[PDB]
């Protein structure tokens, strides 16, 4: 509702919106080991 | 030549279900539009 | 916004090769294993 | 003599086919084990020359750097884990 | 002996397997979801 | 002409394993797409 306080919120903005890309980008990390996993257990289930 | 433990159907599924999940995939990049959907094939592209 | 699109956007030229290659690849998949379940019937040759 | 010299070997040999058809099994399980090492040490590659770039700034690089943090540790996973009936193939313990 | 152990790892394998694919299906639901938060804050910055 | 130890089977039963030895491994290799699966057939190839 003031100016100052306008840039102040959109500096605050730019950060939230780099903490959900760093969250984002751990669970996509975990979810590509999972399915390297996944894939390495559905072959070895088979030969075992 | 044992039967009750058929091998090549294993085999086969586990091939035609890796292969499912690329088409899945790539279905899905074709209906939406996108490369990444769920920014879990690039995080720092996204 | 054009360096955007380079990151983000699929080209469908690209996309619908993919798409046709996997298509072919899942019709023949899909025969591997309905010959692959009918391997064993030689089997039964033996017994009878 | 002769037949039960030949009834032994016979024997021996039956039973040495199925020591090689074990040793077919232990080795195919480790080969297809060490494909998925394989790609994922592929997948690794082209992370790092996806990070090579300077249109990245530390903190994707930082994003970049945690995906192969975890892509490494499946990898040991795979190596600590393949395993036939406790005899740690891919591991190093499975010499001579 | 031999044969139990291979079914059990058999059996293990087998549920591991989707134990995974439940994994999987938690993380991109989550991720699917933080999607609409980053479209939000977006939104945020657009309006300061 | 001595029964009880029919080599004639012996002889057949090695002959059709050692076949479907390799029916399986073409079904395999129709199955996947790849002229190299388990990387135990050509290693400079792999």
Redesign the interface.
Same mark, same amino acid.
């Given at each position: 509702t003031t100016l100052k306080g306008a840039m102040a919120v959109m500096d605050i903005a730019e950060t939230a919106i780099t903490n959900l890309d760093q969250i984002r980008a751990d669970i996509a990390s975990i979810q590509n080991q999972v399915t390297s996993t996944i894939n390495n257990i559905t072959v070895t289930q088979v030969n075992v | 030549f044992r039967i009750n433990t058929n091998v090549a159907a294993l085999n086969a599924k586990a091939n035609s279900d890796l292969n499912a999940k690329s088409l899945d995939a790539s279905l899905s990049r074709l209906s939406s539009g996108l490369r990444i959907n769920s920014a879990a094939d690039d995080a720092s592209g996204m | 916004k054009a360096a955007e699109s380079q990151?983000?956007?699929?080209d469908?030229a690209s996309?619908?090769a +993919?798409?046709s290659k !996997? +298509?072919i690849? !899942?019709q023949?998949? /899909?025969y !591997?294993?309905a010959?692959?379940?009918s /391997?064993?019937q030689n089997?039964l040759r033996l017994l009878q | 003599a002769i037949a039960d010299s030949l009834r032994s070997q016979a024997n021996t040999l039956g039973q040495a086919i199925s020591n090689g058809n074990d040793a077919l099994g232990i080795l195919q399980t480790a080969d297809k084990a060490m494909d998925e090492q394989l790609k994922i040490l592929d997948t690794i590659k082209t992370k790092a020359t996806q990070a090579a770039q300077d249109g990245q700034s530390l903190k994707t690089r930082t994003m970049l750097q945690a995906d192969i943090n975890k892509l490494m540790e499946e990898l040991d996973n795979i190596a600590n884990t393949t395993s036939f009936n406790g005899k740690q193939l891919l591991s190093g313990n499975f010499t001579n």
């Open positions: - | - | 990151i983000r956007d699929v469908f996309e619908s +993919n798409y !996997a +298509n690849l !899942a023949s998949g /899909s !591997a294993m010959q692959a379940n /391997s064993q089997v | -």
